[PDB]
Amino acid sequence: SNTQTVLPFTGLNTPSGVAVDSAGTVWVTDHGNNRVVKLAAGSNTQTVLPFTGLNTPSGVAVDSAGTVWVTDHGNNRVVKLAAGSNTQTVLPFTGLNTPSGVAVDSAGTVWVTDHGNNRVVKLAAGSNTQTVLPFTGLNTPSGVAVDSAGTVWVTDHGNNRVVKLAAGSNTQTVLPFTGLNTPSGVAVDSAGTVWVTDHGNNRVVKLAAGSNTQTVLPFTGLNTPSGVAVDSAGTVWVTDHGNNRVVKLAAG
Numbered sequence: 001s002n003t004q005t006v007l008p009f010t011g012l013n014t015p016s017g018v019a020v021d022s023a024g025t026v027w028v029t030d031h032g033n034n035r036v037v038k039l040a041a042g043s044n045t046q047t048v049l050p051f052t053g054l055n056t057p058s059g060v061a062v063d064s065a066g067t068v069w070v071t072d073h074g075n076n077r078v079v080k081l082a083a084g085s086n087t088q089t090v091l092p093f094t095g096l097n098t099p100s101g102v103a104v105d106s107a108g109t110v111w112v113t114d115h116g117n118n119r120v121v122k123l124a125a126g127s128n129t130q131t132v133l134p135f136t137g138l139n140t141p142s143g144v145a146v147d148s149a150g151t152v153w154v155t156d157h158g159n160n161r162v163v164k165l166a167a168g169s170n171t172q173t174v175l176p177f178t179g180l181n182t183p184s185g186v187a188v189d190s191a192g193t194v195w196v197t198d199h200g201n202n203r204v205v206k207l208a209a210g211s212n213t214q215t216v217l218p219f220t221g222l223n224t225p226s227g228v229a230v231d232s233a234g235t236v237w238v239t240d241h242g243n244n245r246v247v248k249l250a251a252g
Contacts, residue, residue: 113142226240
Protein backbone atom coordinates (compact mmCIF):
# COMPACT_ATOMS: atom_id res chain seq x y z
CA SER A 1 0.00 0.00 0.00
CA ASN A 2 0.80 3.69 0.03
CA THR A 3 -1.11 4.19 3.36
CA GLN A 4 0.87 4.57 6.54
CA THR A 5 -0.88 4.66 9.91
CA VAL A 6 0.43 6.38 13.04
CA LEU A 7 -0.44 4.22 16.02
CA PRO A 8 -2.11 6.04 18.96
CA PHE A 9 0.71 5.71 21.42
CA THR A 10 1.25 8.88 23.43
CA GLY A 11 4.24 10.73 24.78
CA LEU A 12 6.97 8.55 23.29
CA ASN A 13 10.62 9.53 23.45
CA THR A 14 13.27 7.99 21.17
CA PRO A 15 11.39 4.67 20.87
CA SER A 16 13.83 1.83 20.23
CA GLY A 17 12.01 -1.37 19.33
CA VAL A 18 8.70 -3.00 18.51
CA ALA A 19 7.13 -6.47 18.65
CA VAL A 20 3.78 -7.74 17.34
CA ASP A 21 2.04 -11.03 18.19
CA SER A 22 -0.33 -13.17 16.12
CA ALA A 23 -3.36 -11.33 17.57
CA GLY A 24 -1.97 -7.97 16.45
CA THR A 25 -1.07 -6.56 19.85
CA VAL A 26 1.89 -4.17 19.58
CA TRP A 27 4.58 -3.63 22.24
CA VAL A 28 7.13 -0.81 22.06
CA THR A 29 10.24 -0.07 24.11
CA ASP A 30 9.79 3.63 24.90
CA HIS A 31 13.53 4.05 25.42
CA GLY A 32 13.62 7.71 26.47
CA ASN A 33 10.94 7.19 29.13
CA ASN A 34 12.36 3.96 30.58
CA ARG A 35 9.10 2.06 29.97
CA VAL A 36 7.39 -0.49 27.71
CA VAL A 37 4.02 0.43 26.25
CA LYS A 38 1.40 -1.75 24.61
CA LEU A 39 -1.65 -1.33 22.35
CA ALA A 40 -3.76 -4.42 22.88
CA ALA A 41 -5.44 -5.66 19.73
CA GLY A 42 -8.80 -3.90 19.47
CA SER A 43 -7.90 -0.98 21.78
CA ASN A 44 -7.12 2.64 21.09
CA THR A 45 -5.42 3.38 24.43
CA GLN A 46 -1.97 2.22 25.48
CA THR A 47 -1.04 0.54 28.71
CA VAL A 48 2.35 0.58 30.43
CA LEU A 49 3.74 -2.82 31.42
CA PRO A 50 4.67 -3.33 35.10
CA PHE A 51 8.39 -3.69 34.57
CA THR A 52 10.42 -1.89 37.23
CA GLY A 53 13.77 -0.19 37.10
CA LEU A 54 14.32 -0.16 33.34
CA ASN A 55 17.01 2.06 31.87
CA THR A 56 17.05 2.94 28.15
CA PRO A 57 15.29 -0.31 27.16
CA SER A 58 16.40 -1.30 23.67
CA GLY A 59 14.21 -4.12 22.39
CA VAL A 60 11.22 -6.34 23.05
CA ALA A 61 10.10 -9.85 22.08
CA VAL A 62 6.88 -11.73 22.76
CA ASP A 63 5.72 -15.34 22.38
CA SER A 64 2.36 -16.99 21.75
CA ALA A 65 1.76 -17.28 25.52
CA GLY A 66 1.98 -13.50 25.87
CA THR A 67 5.27 -13.55 27.76
CA VAL A 68 7.29 -10.39 27.15
CA TRP A 69 11.10 -10.14 27.19
CA VAL A 70 12.95 -6.81 27.21
CA THR A 71 16.62 -5.94 26.82
CA ASP A 72 17.13 -3.59 29.77
CA HIS A 73 20.07 -1.98 28.00
CA GLY A 74 21.32 0.42 30.67
CA ASN A 75 21.26 -2.28 33.37
CA ASN A 76 23.04 -4.97 31.32
CA ARG A 77 20.21 -7.48 31.75
CA VAL A 78 17.16 -9.10 30.18
CA VAL A 79 13.85 -9.03 32.05
CA LYS A 80 10.67 -11.03 31.51
CA LEU A 81 6.99 -10.69 32.45
CA ALA A 82 4.55 -13.54 32.14
CA ALA A 83 1.00 -12.69 31.12
CA GLY A 84 -0.97 -11.44 34.08
CA SER A 85 2.08 -11.05 36.31
CA ASN A 86 3.09 -7.87 38.08
CA THR A 87 6.64 -8.93 38.98
CA GLN A 88 9.41 -9.40 36.48
CA THR A 89 12.19 -11.96 36.47
CA VAL A 90 15.78 -11.49 35.32
CA LEU A 91 17.13 -14.09 32.90
CA PRO A 92 20.44 -15.85 33.77
CA PHE A 93 22.59 -14.29 31.07
CA THR A 94 26.11 -13.35 32.21
CA GLY A 95 28.37 -10.45 31.44
CA LEU A 96 26.04 -8.62 29.12
CA ASN A 97 27.04 -5.09 28.14
CA THR A 98 24.34 -2.69 26.91
CA PRO A 99 22.32 -5.35 25.07
CA SER A 100 20.48 -3.96 22.05
CA GLY A 101 17.85 -6.50 20.98
CA VAL A 102 16.05 -9.74 21.71
CA ALA A 103 14.13 -12.51 19.91
CA VAL A 104 12.32 -15.62 21.18
CA ASP A 105 10.88 -18.78 19.63
CA SER A 106 8.00 -21.13 20.49
CA ALA A 107 10.25 -23.46 22.52
CA GLY A 108 11.26 -20.57 24.78
CA THR A 109 14.82 -20.05 23.53
CA VAL A 110 15.91 -16.39 23.90
CA TRP A 111 18.51 -14.70 21.65
CA VAL A 112 20.15 -11.39 22.55
CA THR A 113 22.42 -9.01 20.65
CA ASP A 114 25.04 -8.32 23.32
CA HIS A 115 25.93 -5.03 21.67
CA GLY A 116 28.72 -3.90 24.00
CA ASN A 117 30.54 -7.21 23.64
CA ASN A 118 30.15 -7.49 19.84
CA ARG A 119 28.42 -10.86 20.11
CA VAL A 120 25.08 -12.67 20.06
CA VAL A 121 24.13 -14.99 22.93
CA LYS A 122 21.24 -17.36 23.53
CA LEU A 123 19.68 -19.22 26.42
CA ALA A 124 17.87 -22.41 25.70
CA ALA A 125 14.76 -22.63 27.92
CA GLY A 126 15.85 -23.92 31.34
CA SER A 127 19.51 -23.17 30.76
CA ASN A 128 21.74 -21.30 33.15
CA THR A 129 24.59 -21.15 30.65
CA GLN A 130 24.26 -18.90 27.66
CA THR A 131 25.74 -19.93 24.33
CA VAL A 132 27.81 -17.51 22.26
CA LEU A 133 26.66 -17.95 18.66
CA PRO A 134 29.37 -18.53 16.01
CA PHE A 135 29.20 -15.13 14.37
CA THR A 136 32.56 -13.50 13.68
CA GLY A 137 33.69 -9.92 13.32
CA LEU A 138 30.50 -8.25 14.56
CA ASN A 139 30.56 -4.62 15.58
CA THR A 140 27.89 -3.10 17.85
CA PRO A 141 25.18 -5.50 16.61
CA SER A 142 21.82 -3.77 16.82
CA GLY A 143 19.04 -6.31 16.41
CA VAL A 144 18.13 -9.95 15.96
CA ALA A 145 15.26 -11.90 14.44
CA VAL A 146 14.55 -15.63 14.40
CA ASP A 147 12.18 -17.83 12.45
CA SER A 148 10.36 -21.07 13.35
CA ALA A 149 13.22 -23.13 11.85
CA GLY A 150 15.69 -21.57 14.29
CA THR A 151 17.53 -19.47 11.74
CA VAL A 152 18.94 -16.29 13.30
CA TRP A 153 19.48 -12.96 11.49
CA VAL A 154 21.51 -10.12 12.98
CA THR A 155 22.00 -6.55 11.90
CA ASP A 156 25.76 -6.04 12.20
CA HIS A 157 25.39 -2.29 12.64
CA GLY A 158 29.05 -1.29 12.70
CA ASN A 159 29.82 -3.19 9.50
CA ASN A 160 26.74 -2.17 7.51
CA ARG A 161 25.63 -5.76 6.88
CA VAL A 162 23.14 -8.45 7.91
CA VAL A 163 24.45 -11.90 8.87
CA LYS A 164 22.58 -15.17 9.44
CA LEU A 165 23.10 -18.63 10.92
CA ALA A 166 20.78 -21.56 10.26
CA ALA A 167 20.27 -24.02 13.10
CA GLY A 168 23.30 -26.25 13.30
CA SER A 169 25.42 -24.05 11.02
CA ASN A 170 28.86 -22.88 12.11
CA THR A 171 29.44 -20.74 8.98
CA GLN A 172 27.81 -17.31 9.05
CA THR A 173 26.27 -15.97 5.82
CA VAL A 174 26.36 -12.32 4.79
CA LEU A 175 23.08 -11.41 3.09
CA PRO A 176 22.99 -9.60 -0.29
CA PHE A 177 21.64 -6.33 1.06
CA THR A 178 23.37 -3.32 -0.46
CA GLY A 179 23.94 0.27 0.58
CA LEU A 180 23.15 -0.13 4.28
CA ASN A 181 24.37 2.42 6.80
CA THR A 182 24.17 1.89 10.55
CA PRO A 183 21.27 -0.61 10.21
CA SER A 184 19.23 -0.74 13.41
CA GLY A 185 16.86 -3.73 13.27
CA VAL A 186 15.66 -6.74 11.35
CA ALA A 187 12.45 -8.74 10.95
CA VAL A 188 11.63 -11.90 9.01
CA ASP A 189 8.54 -13.78 7.95
CA SER A 190 7.90 -17.47 7.30
CA ALA A 191 8.29 -16.94 3.55
CA GLY A 192 11.99 -16.04 3.99
CA THR A 193 11.57 -12.32 3.37
CA VAL A 194 13.90 -10.06 5.40
CA TRP A 195 13.19 -6.43 6.32
CA VAL A 196 15.79 -4.04 7.74
CA THR A 197 15.55 -0.57 9.23
CA ASP A 198 18.40 1.07 7.33
CA HIS A 199 18.69 3.76 9.97
CA GLY A 200 21.51 5.77 8.39
CA ASN A 201 19.59 6.12 5.13
CA ASN A 202 16.21 6.82 6.80
CA ARG A 203 14.58 3.90 5.00
CA VAL A 204 13.15 0.42 5.41
CA VAL A 205 14.35 -2.12 2.89
CA LYS A 206 12.94 -5.53 1.98
CA LEU A 207 15.01 -8.40 0.54
CA ALA A 208 12.79 -10.82 -1.39
CA ALA A 209 13.50 -14.52 -0.93
CA GLY A 210 15.07 -16.30 -3.87
CA SER A 211 15.38 -13.38 -6.23
CA ASN A 212 17.34 -11.35 -3.67
CA THR A 213 15.63 -8.27 -5.06
CA GLN A 214 15.92 -5.32 -2.65
CA THR A 215 13.09 -2.75 -2.53
CA VAL A 216 12.46 0.33 -0.42
CA LEU A 217 9.14 0.44 1.39
CA PRO A 218 7.15 3.65 0.68
CA PHE A 219 7.10 4.97 4.22
CA THR A 220 7.12 8.75 4.37
CA GLY A 221 8.63 11.21 6.80
CA LEU A 222 10.85 8.73 8.68
CA ASN A 223 13.88 9.83 10.62
CA THR A 224 16.49 7.56 12.25
CA PRO A 225 14.14 4.54 12.29
CA SER A 226 15.24 2.28 15.09
CA GLY A 227 13.33 -1.00 14.88
CA VAL A 228 10.95 -3.10 12.87
CA ALA A 229 8.39 -5.90 13.15
CA VAL A 230 6.33 -7.70 10.51
CA ASP A 231 3.30 -9.93 10.49
CA SER A 232 2.56 -12.82 8.13
CA ALA A 233 0.48 -10.54 5.84
CA GLY A 234 3.51 -8.34 5.18
CA THR A 235 2.37 -5.39 7.28
CA VAL A 236 5.43 -3.65 8.63
CA TRP A 237 5.69 -1.66 11.86
CA VAL A 238 8.55 0.77 12.42
CA THR A 239 9.68 2.75 15.43
CA ASP A 240 10.22 6.13 13.82
CA HIS A 241 12.68 7.11 16.51
CA GLY A 242 13.48 10.62 15.28
CA ASN A 243 9.79 11.57 15.26
CA ASN A 244 8.80 9.86 18.53
CA ARG A 245 6.13 7.74 16.81
CA VAL A 246 5.30 4.24 15.60
CA VAL A 247 4.02 3.77 12.07
CA LYS A 248 2.73 0.83 10.09
CA LEU A 249 2.34 0.12 6.36
CA ALA A 250 0.27 -2.77 4.93
CA ALA A 251 1.83 -4.79 2.12
CA GLY A 252 1.85 -3.06 -1.25
